Design a protein around this ligand. Sequence first.
Ligand SMILES: [K+]
Ligand SMILES: [K+]
Ligand SMILES: [K+]
Ligand SMILES: [K+]
Ligand SMILES: [K+]
Ligand SMILES: [K+]
Ligand SMILES: [K+]
Ligand SMILES: [Mg+2]
Ligand SMILES: [Mg+2]
Ligand SMILES: [Mg+2]
Ligand SMILES: [Mg+2]
Ligand SMILES: [Mg+2]
Ligand SMILES: [Mg+2]
Ligand SMILES: [Mg+2]
Ligand SMILES: [Mg+2]
Ligand SMILES: [Mg+2]
Ligand SMILES: [Mg+2]
Ligand SMILES: [Mg+2]
Ligand SMILES: [Mg+2]
Ligand SMILES: [Mg+2]
Ligand SMILES: [Zn+2]
Lengths: 140, 140, 185, 75, 64, 142, 104, 50
Amino acid sequence: PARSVKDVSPHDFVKAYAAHLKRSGKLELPEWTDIVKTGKLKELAPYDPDWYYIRAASMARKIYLRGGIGVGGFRRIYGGNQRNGSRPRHFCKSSGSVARHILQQLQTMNIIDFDPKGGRRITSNGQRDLDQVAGRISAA
Amino acid sequence: VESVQCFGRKKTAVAVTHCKRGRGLIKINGVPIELVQPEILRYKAFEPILLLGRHRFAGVDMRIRVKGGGHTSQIYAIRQSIAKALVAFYQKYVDEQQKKEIKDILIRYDRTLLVADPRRCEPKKFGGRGARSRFQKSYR
Amino acid sequence: PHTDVLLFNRWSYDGVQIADMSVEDYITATANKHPTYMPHTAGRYQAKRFRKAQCPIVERLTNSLMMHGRNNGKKLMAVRIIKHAMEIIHLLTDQNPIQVIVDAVINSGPREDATRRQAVDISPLRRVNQAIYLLTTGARESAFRNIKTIAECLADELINAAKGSSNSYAIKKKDEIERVAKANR
Amino acid sequence: KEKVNNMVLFDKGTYDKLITEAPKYKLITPSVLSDRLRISGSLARKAIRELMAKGLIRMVSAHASQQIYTRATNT
Amino acid sequence: ESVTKHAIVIKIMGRTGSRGQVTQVRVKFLDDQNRFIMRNVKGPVREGDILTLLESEREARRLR
Amino acid sequence: SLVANEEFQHILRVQNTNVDGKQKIMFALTSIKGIGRRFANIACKKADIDMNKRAGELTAAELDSLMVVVANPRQFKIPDWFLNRQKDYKDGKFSQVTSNALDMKLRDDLERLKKIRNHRGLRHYWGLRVRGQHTKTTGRRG
Amino acid sequence: MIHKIRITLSSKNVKNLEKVCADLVRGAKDKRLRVKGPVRMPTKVLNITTRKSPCGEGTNTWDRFELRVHKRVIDLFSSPDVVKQITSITIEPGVEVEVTIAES
Amino acid sequence: WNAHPKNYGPGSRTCRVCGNPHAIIRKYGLMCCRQCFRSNAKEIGFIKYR
RNA sequence: AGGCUGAUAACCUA
RNA sequence: AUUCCGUUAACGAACGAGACCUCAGCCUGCUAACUAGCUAUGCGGAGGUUCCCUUCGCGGCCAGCUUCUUAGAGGGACUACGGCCUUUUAGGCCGCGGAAGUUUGAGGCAAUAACAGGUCUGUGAUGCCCUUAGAUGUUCUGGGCCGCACGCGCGCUACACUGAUGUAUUCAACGAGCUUAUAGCCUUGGCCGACAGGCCCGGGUAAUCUUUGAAAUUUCAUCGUGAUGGGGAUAGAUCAUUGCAAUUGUUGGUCUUCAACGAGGAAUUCCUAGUAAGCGCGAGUCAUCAGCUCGCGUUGACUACGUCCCUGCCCUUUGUACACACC
RNA sequence: UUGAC
Ligand SMILES: [K+]
Ligand SMILES: [K+]
Ligand SMILES: [K+]
Ligand SMILES: [K+]
Ligand SMILES: [K+]
Ligand SMILES: [K+]
Ligand SMILES: [K+]
Ligand SMILES: [Mg+2]
Ligand SMILES: [Mg+2]
Ligand SMILES: [Mg+2]
Ligand SMILES: [Mg+2]
Ligand SMILES: [Mg+2]
Ligand SMILES: [Mg+2]
Ligand SMILES: [Mg+2]
Ligand SMILES: [Mg+2]
Ligand SMILES: [Mg+2]
Ligand SMILES: [Mg+2]
Ligand SMILES: [Mg+2]
Ligand SMILES: [Mg+2]
Ligand SMILES: [Mg+2]
Ligand SMILES: [Zn+2]
């Protein structure tokens, strides 16, 4: 067979493609990578030192699967439950600066572009890049 | 065009399996069924294949679309749509006696493989937070 | 008889026997009585009396793990716990984990009780219900505020109960129930 | 109710006990080692990885919540 | 001394006890199938199912 | 995994506080007043300290570099919004105040309000709630 | 020459709405016009839930009030003048007819 | 006289039927108090089914 | 002081 | 079920119950959809080996079609069928088949006679009484309704490892939405910002746009039985938003502070299946404010299939010095 | 006699 993104486990793919983005050296991490949290719903900053590449790999896989997602859509996708002390939990959005910065980097890498109807769309080069990485993952 | 389209239901989940003459492909929304999530419910979705055997599916291609419901109910809807689609395919394009044989196997194992569960959520009534549950009563 | 259905696709129902006349018809763990690949069926077992005796014994154990309130309805976690516990049981005992589970249920079911107080006999169905309740109550209590995981506690509870050892929480409670019953004869 | 005092790092005496006795256990989990060797669960998780690297124990089940290991060779 | 025996339920006499929590049944001993007695049973029981009697000498009074 | 060497310490002393040596360094620093989990984590990153090791494994030099970060956050580019004393009332400066300096700062805040007979200062003096909470039914501990 | 004209019908009364829809489709089939519909939009259920008591005493009972709106859409391929002729027929009470030239 | 702003809040809105300011139903633009609405519900077109 | 009682006494708990 | 069969000095009727109406459950049958889709086909992108295969995007009022969606009309269950039990009865138990075999589930409606039950503070419903210009009318400014030794009721969050945290991953339903004034409602997309929030271009008076629309859960890692990374009260500093106005913190952020609480005495509530419980969402209120209420779905059990012991209710017989009726 | 107990 010939595996593409849909044919491989999402967990395995994101790890492999994140190591691919870091290895290329094309993403320019912002100054505040080590300081920020990924939303006000969080208590602490991410544990993984390479969380930025992991998030960028995850966002590329979602644009590959569905076009037209904007920054607001990604804030919802990585949002979740916020705890409010002695009050009930409610849904909260995640950081827009993290989403916007990652999208603007993947676009300079030519993995995504502007969808005419709004949001971001995977490019032909982006499709090849993601599909080639998925093909190299060992069968597991 | 020897194809059938059978649905399965569980609560608000609806899965429709498009079963056509093929070579044995089985995919859910473009993803191979071997990657069904969650992984512990993967056994439930594979029961029709395990019960009948892969050799019964060698001459068909099943593409499944599922919507609504939740993680558990979508598996049961998918599980039901696959069984119904194969039975509808054998009746229409293979034989009546072969349809008789496989349907007996599916029924002897579990009747919900072919017959939907009619249970739905009971509406909430005022004076309590559930359908039955009432607000706590105090006297003094 | 023989069946191709394996629990979790790991454990065989062949060779599993219920060596107790009273509760044989109320434990569903053999190859002839509807073997199941997984202990998760959206069954309707409360529609009628004695209908839950057809529910597989492994799934009846899984349901009793969805306590207390914090764990209500978290059946995917419960199925995982029993899946891990059976793996642990196989390592420690070198026996079929399904066979060990039925032995634990048979040994931990009280056969006499007190009511009103005088001694009365317990029906085979309630005996199975009590055994399941006692086994999961002991595992839950030993896991609480303990480094030991719930799966390891459940495996040890079942291994001791299947052996008949007093180390089991369910064996001690069964003795206490039958000790008070004899005092009120 | 007394408080456990689980060591966060091995000492020469306990580390040698791990390399000799632990490979012989039928069931090896972080909580089994944590209780037998009086080590914290965090140290037990790292210790199990070392035993895996040395090839002294084989894996039976892997789950984020429950990890199950056993002696590589029986008896 | 008490000897454990197994007996099969023949007929359901009726629910007894203050709150109806007990059932009186007629049981036939399996070892000797010509002996019948009445027993009080806690929990759901139906005709046909088998019981374990820790002591078989006692007998329950009708409508106890 | 690794064996502890003789340099391992079970108790440390930082800014007149007892720091447990068996705790992960990130959570060992939180025992200092004015340093929470968010600030302890950023301090270890700016000091290039491996957060995977225990506080007792750190050398004396490494432990000191942590307190240099805490004392000069702006020098290490920790932003102003991340500090527990932003735009001080007297000096207007931004800083992270810890241990007794934090206790002195809290004392000066309440004394200032009480001195001008501010409403919030008076409720601090009377031992009442100051953040608009109803007091009819809760907070009954006297 | 031939244009897709959209007719929208709304009403609270289903029988009256279905009666007018049949009169229009059947009235257009007589002229041999191409007809698309009627298309039934999902029913809009306006809902007001209110306390029965005019005061606050007694068991707190609630009245659930519902006002259902049914909507039909019929597309006729013909000229505006012909459509104006078909729709000009007297319409049943409470049925709101709305003729627009589909923007396509 | 009447100088205080009345652009928002209960004081700005009143029942269209009776003029009372309490328990106004603003949904769908009804602008009736809950008591007047129940009296006039049938005439407005609202009905009880379940 | 709380609980039990429509309420009081009795009773039960702290 | 005062539901029926029968009995019978009654006969024949009227209400309530049932019927009924709404929602839900079955229909590969009917009607028919560019504001809902599917299948096929054409073109294009990517992967694998030019055909071919896998996957995604776009197009076609002359591809076809209605399985999935919507909503009209109908059909479908009657305990029909089998066994047994009951009086020839009325009916009941078990079972096949069946979407469904508790009046299939859940509601709405709902008799006679009552209560000195609640409401004059919903009403341009209202009698009498009071007040009516140093007003109990009305409006304006400010404060109060929230004030805190204490007692009680409905709740929310917890005491952790069946967990918290950080990743990765991923599936609902009910519903609601604007005066267009630069723009007053729901808001996509782009940009700026760590967050909170701001700017710009727009869509939608709506199966068309928001809506590509949740959480618990799943998954990997860290933590390791320590009031601990459990818990988040109390409190300091500071930033932003709503408003004419935020102090007695409106609310929302950031760092810091880090209380009780280790499962709860006597007592006591609710609940029999998609129910309990857990999990979040919409709506009402609303400039701003939800720990509340009314609905919605998601995950999904234990136990019982009884009894009149407790608390009550219905019918019959019976006792009564009670009729304001055993308070 | 009817109710209530
Ligand atoms: K998320
Ligand atoms: K107080
Ligand atoms: K292609
Ligand atoms: K009134
Ligand atoms: K009056
Ligand atoms: K009012
Ligand atoms: K706090
Ligand atoms: Mg600190
Ligand atoms: Mg206040
Ligand atoms: Mg259809
Ligand atoms: Mg119908
Ligand atoms: Mg009545
Ligand atoms: Mg009165
Ligand atoms: Mg008040
Ligand atoms: Mg209430
Ligand atoms: Mg916490
Ligand atoms: Mg979705
Ligand atoms: Mg703490
Ligand atoms: Mg307010
Ligand atoms: Mg309220
Ligand atoms: Zn009004």
